[PDB]
Amino acid sequence: KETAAAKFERQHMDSSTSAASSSNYCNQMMKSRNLTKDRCKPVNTFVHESLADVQAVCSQKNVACKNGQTNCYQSYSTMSITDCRETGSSKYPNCAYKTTQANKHIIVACEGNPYVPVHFDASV
Ligand SMILES: [Cl-]
């Protein structure tokens, strides 16, 4: 019974490093966050900012989510993030990922009391 908010943290927060420093980051991180247990999660973004900075996005620029709901928010500023996407050859359970480090806005869906990120929608 992971809360939605806890699952967001597990899948998307990496406040421990300022940036991915190697092309192996995603392989490493997708494994360790247990995102390849039953299947290779195809796409996943990690954010290298404080939890407070990411939660704060729920008070920033209100936008529509990909799914048409309107509980999404875009960060006013760029954030250090790392995009992880499964390579075309990748085959469970030898999950393999392309790592791309970047500085982009994040868009998250927020829910609850407290009103916190529960879904990563996109980076811009
Ligand atoms: Cl879910």
Swiss-Prot record:
Pancreas. The keyword Signal applies. Glycans are attached at K1, K7, N34, K37, K41. Its EC number is 4.6.1.18. Disulfide bonds join C26-C84, C40-C95, C58-C110, C65-C72. It is found in: Secreted. One of its GO terms (biological process) is defense response to Gram-positive bacterium. GO terms for cellular component: extracellular region. The keyword Hydrolase applies. Substrate binds at K7, R10, K41, P42, V43, N44, T45, K66, R85. It is an enzyme of class 4 (lyase). Its main location: secreted. The active site is at H12 (proton acceptor), H119 (proton donor). GO terms for molecular function: lyase activity; nucleic acid binding; ribonuclease A activity; RNA nuclease activity. Belongs to the pancreatic ribonuclease family. Interacts with and forms tight 1:1 complexes with RNH1. Dimerization of two such complexes may occur. Interaction with RNH1 inhibits this protein. Monomer. This is Ribonuclease pancreatic. It comes from Bos taurus (Bovine). The lineage of its organism: Eukaryota, Metazoa, Chordata, Craniata, Vertebrata. The chain holds residues 27 to 150 of 150 of the full protein.
